[PDB]
Write a protein that binds this DNA or RNA. Sequence first.
RNA 1: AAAUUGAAGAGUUUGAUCAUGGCUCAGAUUGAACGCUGGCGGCAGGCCUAACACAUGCAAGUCGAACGGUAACAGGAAGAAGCUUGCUUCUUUGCUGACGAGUGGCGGACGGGUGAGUAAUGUCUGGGAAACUGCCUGAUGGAGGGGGAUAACUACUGGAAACGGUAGCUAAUACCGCAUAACGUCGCAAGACCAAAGAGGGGGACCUUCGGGCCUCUUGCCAUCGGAUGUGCCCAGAUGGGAUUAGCUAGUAGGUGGGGUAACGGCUCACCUAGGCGACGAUCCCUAGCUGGUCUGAGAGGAUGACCAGCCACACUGGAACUGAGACACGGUCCAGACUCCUACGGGAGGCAGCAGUGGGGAAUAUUGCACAAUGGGCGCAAGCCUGAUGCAGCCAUGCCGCGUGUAUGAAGAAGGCCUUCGGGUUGUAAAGUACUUUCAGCGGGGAGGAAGGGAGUAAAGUUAAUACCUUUGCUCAUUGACGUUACCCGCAGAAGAAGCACCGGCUAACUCCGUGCCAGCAGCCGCGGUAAUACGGAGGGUGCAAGCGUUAAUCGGAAUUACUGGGC
Lengths: 82, 703, 85, 205, 62
Amino acid sequence: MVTIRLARHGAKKRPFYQVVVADSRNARNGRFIERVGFFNPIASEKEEGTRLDLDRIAHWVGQGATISDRVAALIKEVNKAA
Amino acid sequence: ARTTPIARYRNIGISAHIDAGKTTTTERILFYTGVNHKIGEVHDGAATMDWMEQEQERGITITSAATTAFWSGMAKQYEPHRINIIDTPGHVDFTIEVERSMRVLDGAVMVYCAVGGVQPQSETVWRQANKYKVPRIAFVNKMDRMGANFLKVVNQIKTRLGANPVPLQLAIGAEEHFTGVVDLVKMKAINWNDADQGVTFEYEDIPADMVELANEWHQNLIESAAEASEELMEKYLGGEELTEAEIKGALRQRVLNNEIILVTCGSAFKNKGVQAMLDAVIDYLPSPVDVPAINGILDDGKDTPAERHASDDEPFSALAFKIATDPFVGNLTFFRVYSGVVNSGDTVLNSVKAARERFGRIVQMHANKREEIKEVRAGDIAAAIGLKDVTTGDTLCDPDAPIILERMEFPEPVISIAVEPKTKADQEKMGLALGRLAKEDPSFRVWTDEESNQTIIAGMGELHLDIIVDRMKREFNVEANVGKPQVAYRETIRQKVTDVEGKHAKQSGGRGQYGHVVIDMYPLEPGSNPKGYEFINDIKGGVIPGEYIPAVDKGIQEQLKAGPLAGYPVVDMGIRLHFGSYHDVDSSELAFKLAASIAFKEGFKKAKPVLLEPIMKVEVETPEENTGDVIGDLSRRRGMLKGQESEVTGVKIHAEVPLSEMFGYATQLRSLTKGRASYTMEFLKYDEAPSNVAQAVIEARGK
Amino acid sequence: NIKSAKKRAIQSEKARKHNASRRSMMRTFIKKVYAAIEAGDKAAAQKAFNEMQPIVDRQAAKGLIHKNKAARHKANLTAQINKLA
Amino acid sequence: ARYLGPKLKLSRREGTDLFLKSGVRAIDTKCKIEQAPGQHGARKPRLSDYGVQLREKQKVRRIYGVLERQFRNYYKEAARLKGNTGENLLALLEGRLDNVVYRMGFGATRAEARQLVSHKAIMVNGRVVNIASYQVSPNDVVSIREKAKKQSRVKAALELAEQREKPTWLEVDAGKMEGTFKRKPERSDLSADINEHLIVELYSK
Amino acid sequence: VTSYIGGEGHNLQEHSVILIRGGRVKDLPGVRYHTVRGALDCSGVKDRKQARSKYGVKRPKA
RNA sequence: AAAUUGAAGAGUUUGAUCAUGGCUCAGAUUGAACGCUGGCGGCAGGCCUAACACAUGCAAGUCGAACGGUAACAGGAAGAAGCUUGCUUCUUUGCUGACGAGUGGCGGACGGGUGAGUAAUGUCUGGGAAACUGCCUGAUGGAGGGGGAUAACUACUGGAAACGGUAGCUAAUACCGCAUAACGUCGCAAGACCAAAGAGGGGGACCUUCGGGCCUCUUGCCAUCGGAUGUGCCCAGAUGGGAUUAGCUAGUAGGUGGGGUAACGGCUCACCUAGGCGACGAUCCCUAGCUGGUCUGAGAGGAUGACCAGCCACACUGGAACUGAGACACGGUCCAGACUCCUACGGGAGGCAGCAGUGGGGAAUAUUGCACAAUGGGCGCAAGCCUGAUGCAGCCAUGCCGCGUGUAUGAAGAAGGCCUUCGGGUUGUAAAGUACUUUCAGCGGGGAGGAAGGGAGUAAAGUUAAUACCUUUGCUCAUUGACGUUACCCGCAGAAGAAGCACCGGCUAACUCCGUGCCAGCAGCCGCGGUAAUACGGAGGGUGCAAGCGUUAAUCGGAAUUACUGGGC
Ligand SMILES: Nc1nc2c(ncn2[C@@H]2O[C@H](COP(=O)(O)OP(=O)(O)O)[C@@H](O)[C@H]2O)c(=O)[nH]1
């Protein structure tokens, strides 16, 4: 089940997660088949402080992946209805 | 919340003379409450209170280990109470274990033998109980043995220790006719069952062979209890006997106020009387709150700076009274929660040692087994694990400061020897175990020596150091073969001044510059200058350079500390200086100092100082039975003696003895007076004596 | 054991007994057919094959062996039977 | 971390004037600035090649108040940058917030300027910077953060700030107490007394 | 292996522990190990005032 | 557009030179150690050796929306204790929430630790066919019908402790056979054979044994072909040294046949062939986890596997398999061996290379800490639980970076030190003095962000047959932060509460005096010291570096000193 979750790269008291498509087996920072876009929760003015890659996310979720809660909410946002 | 109200707690101590049956009675109590099967004995080591393997083999309880149970007085065997017994040892060597324990209990059942009555160690723990007014009852153990009597023991306690004992029991049968106990409150005679089946009671009628004496001590108990308060006196004066409940409450108040001591009989080996002693534990000893409220103090002393009491709401305020050595987690600190509630991992501010501590775990005990429990509340003894800074006697509390608990007292050791491991490489691996042991035990002081490189230690008897040396070999696997401490001889001239010089210069071929000084060797009487060195200047010829005179005294200082006799610091010595030679150029003080070296070493040796040996001021207080005998031993040693004054309970005798001889003096002292002597050894003077032991250091190095 | 793996060991042992039983039935019938083959009686052989075929298919569907194992078995036996002629 | 100790000792050992003290009165009337600080300064040391290299680098270091650590980094970067390494080093040395503060005034010497910059009494374009090594970018107002005025030492320093060249990169307002940063100060915009190629060869040795 | 004992005046008996650091002696034949002065009862040289870290002396207070 | 603009030398053999020639030095770097010293802050780092033995607390549970049910807590119903028919609580009652234990399903084979083993069964690079693949997804259908136990239990009996029995039942998605199933399996076909589980949510119709049925919807199950993820297998090449290691190998290499694995295969068996590996190093021996990369280097190259990540092997040692999709399984099984602990003496339990921590080894490396608040992960429909992963914290200058230990002024050049040609020079504007400020740490107040979500109430369509149940989208309301006294801001008094270490003979930057006389001693090489020591030690003074300084160890360079670029007889 290829989960699409956040990877928590970065530093202490300064998260910078990373949207990754990986098997739900491997670790958080672990192996992934691809990463698709980044996310930062303390970016004041940066690249939206958030980015997804909707084409590749569509590729995966259509071919049979799943989506974690944070990546799902981030897509709910990038789809600018809310 | 808490499993039981406070009135169900009874914190009692078991303490007595050696071998009086403390551990046997404790194991019987544990069995009769059911945490132990197989009543077990001690001479076969199988008892569970004994774990350290020394008391397994040697069959002598060496250290206290608290233990809990559920025995009950109201409809006994039901409505359980919490009896926290502390099996303390009774050895004079381990009286420190009694000291800290007696200071941490709210009551304690004293054990007496029916063969000897009180014994010197019991007269000791009696002082250690009056020291804190610890309420207490008596348990006359070993009635089953030959020549054992009860009324004689009662008279013994009445007459010798000074108390008032009242029979709560009278015994049916003395030696082997002992079949049970008759009472003076229930007024019914209990005949216990056969071997190891004494769990039962078989309440039975009082036999007529003892009805009259039972009646006599019954009425005596009645009037002695009515002595507690007025409303118990007139009711009795009206021709009516009080009843069980009010007699029990009145006597119990007497025990609270520390006026009386109750005696119960039994034979912990024939399994008789143990339960009926537990009956007294319940019915008369104070509960944690029945005791007057603990005297807490703030950072300053008042009458009531911190009025603390046993409550689940009161601040957590307790007394860390016992440390223990654990190899696994480092230490293991007992503590008796006087007030409040504390939990695992919770904080605690070490009010005395000026730090905050934490409770990695809180473990209550089954004599060794550390029961893992969440929290401990008031009146409930527990052992804290992991807290680093705390030692014995410290006080642990919340940030609201009942900081000052009253005691910081512990006795002074009397025996001292030195130790040495398999080789002098393991000396730190030895001092480490020594540090652990000295942080665990207050009376035992590891005493690093400065005069020699040996490590000497001090204890309170041949046996205490003996457990320590084996416990060191056993728990800390470094064996130390022992010897005597080295002596501390010294040097100083008698009275006479002797004129001497020492001459040698340097630069005949262009070299650096020289020194030269004349000196005269005057001593002062032993104890004249409190500063061990006194100087008077008399330079008038060949006046040594203006920045060199003080360095001349400071260089003869080296020669003083050197002590050209056998290496020993010369004491009270004085040197006076007259002559020399100089120019208005840069001479060398070091040459004056070597010059002064030759001068010192010749003039002292020819002025004939004295080679003194350490002589200690001794004080010994011993009963009037063996005053002559102990003085005789002292005179056979080197007897110099001070005087004689009759104390209330003995004689005041001081003396002067050599430290070269007082080494093993403690065991011999106590053996000469049954251990009823008190004494401390301290220094008074150094002095000479005709002895051919005076050349050991001279043999190792020097003239 | 210290954990809830005890329940798993117990369930695994129960399943061991059971899978041993079913596997034993399968292999009993397979030895039946192999005897019929080594003998030379073709009609008896095909009878034994039809006796075992539903068992082994049911078992593979039960997962005790794998569909490839059942198919390999039936293939081996059908081939050697038609060779028996 | 800041160089604690005598200042004219440094300036006099290096011989040349490095402005460690406030340029108020004079230098040779207060210290006999021709000879080493030691009692052996009357002697003339020969100062071979490595002598002159260490002396040059120590001159620039004592002028700017940066230490050999973070100075090796001021070489690491400004060598990483494309172009002349010595000139890029002087660029990043000039852009230091203390240097720009002193050069716009506010403090008669680098030490007073650093005490200011570190006492939370400056505001690089609105933001209080307490970092004496804040590398200032071009096009930045310095905004001395009023209530850092009215102490009279910054005023005396602003008075003494003239008789000195108004540097061609500073454009300090001088009276509302701010200052733009037009462009990175050139190497030619500097004293030309300091051989940056000496420092470059010293560190690339 | 062998070992130098630097500094002025040592106190190393037949069974005292010492620490060993590198660095030969360049004139003593075959001695290639300086005894680390001031560690494990191999106490530092006494009455020193310059270069105390090497040779293990406590900084005097004054 | 930038993806680089990057290569230094000296001391040292000789009376002296030149050259080969080795030793050492300045540089960068470290899981570092130790001595001296030591203020803060941020971010990283922390048992390299004994894969040595381990106390203890935790490191894996979840699911009632699978079942029987009721251990505990309650929502509960009827009462004649209590009692003023109860607001002043007695019990039968799984009826409902909820749930001990049990059955069952899913996980436990993940996450995490170590580098012993491993020279090729591996790793990396690039391909391949002889396959599997739970949970995840697309599609297509089925989802008759019934029975046999058994747990829990109950009774009785052991366990004189722990830990087990003999009979009696009763449920389920547990299990078993028949019905059926085909583009599924076998078979050239002909032909035969194959499976399944139900639960939950609502309710208008209508029959009921108030159990429900029934029309719904949400989930779930079986089978079949795909997608994806993970995984198994094969090949070519590289992946340390030693030939003072020249032969090695009978399942050994292959053919045929049988068997076996999910899969191809000497994986195995049985014949038959006599082959196969090898100087391109077979075999043997020592050593070693490989790699992305790290230190260095200008580059080729040298050394290396600390951190983070991928692969592999391992989980007290040796051997084996059981369930399973996945293991030959760290906190599962079983046996042998060692060890440990409990034993009531009849027995039984355990495996820190998980996190903490102990003891031992070492020179050396941390608390028996805080919480799921983020991220995750398992289970669950979800709330919700577990999480020593994780997020944080505590210790240590272990490292990298930033900052301060005040700033200006000041010639009575104070004192005093030291030197001296005896006038003075230098410490030195240095301190004292004078004014200015408060960074940092200390107090006091104020205060972001890490917070996404999920709960209840509500509306829109979507659903049906119902506008009911439920996705799903908004809406309003209370809220979910360990760190934590966060970062930070501002105020409070004062310059206080905060500088050391090494070197100073040439290499090298920094020189004089006293004390020592080949003694004490120093030292990286050259050497210094035997009376005028810039070379020992101290003083003064200076030079470097600065919360470090120095020493040692270690890789590389400089070493064109293994020279392929880049050397010689
Ligand atoms: N006869 C008799 N002997 C006793 C009794 N209690 C203890 N002992 C004996 O005393 C010896 C040691 O007893 P112990 O428990 O060591 O006494 P403790 O040293 O005071 O605890 C054993 O041999 C017992 O047999 C008693 O009540 N009666």
